[PDB]
């Protein structure tokens, strides 16, 4: 029933409004196509929005904290892998303001 909210959180994230800085997170990070020789060495557990939406559909999340853990690991991963002055970092924080806000104003 809280997952009725995470569904609305996920749609908000995936909406056109945010498309300018959400696109790095639509699909799993493609290490081979971008030449990130070191990526899967640094990031043990990759995550993206497509993958969140799939786990949401196979109902692989029991409650809201499990969903939020995947959403945050997604951001944590960009932070870990990328230097502080890269564009992808800033996109990550913009998207994360949207998530942390909408996630905090969850009824319960």
């Amino acid at each position: 029933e809280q997952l009725k909210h995470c569904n609305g959180i996920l749609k908000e994230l995936l909406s056109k409004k945010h498309a300018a800085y959400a696109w790095p997170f639509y699909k799993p990070v493609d290490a081979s196509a971008l030449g990130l020789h070191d990526y899967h060495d640094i990031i043990k557990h990759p995550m993206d929005l497509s993958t969140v939406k799939r786990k949401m559909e196979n109902r692989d999340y029991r409650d809201a904290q499990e969903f939020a853990a995947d959403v945050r690991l997604m951001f944590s991963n960009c932070y870990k892998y990328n230097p502080p002055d890269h564009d992808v970092v800033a996109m990550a924080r913009k998207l994360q303001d949207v998530f942390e806000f909408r996630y905090a104003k969850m009824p319960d």
Binding site: P24, L34, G35, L36, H37, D38, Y81, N82, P83, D85, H86, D87, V88, V89, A90, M91
Partner: peptide, 15 residues
């Protein structure tokens, strides 16, 4: 290789 995706100093904003 190194460290990012190639967007060092790209984009707009961030102080």
């Amino acid at each position: 290789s190194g460290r990012g995706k190639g967007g060092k100093g790209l984009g707009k904003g961030g102080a």
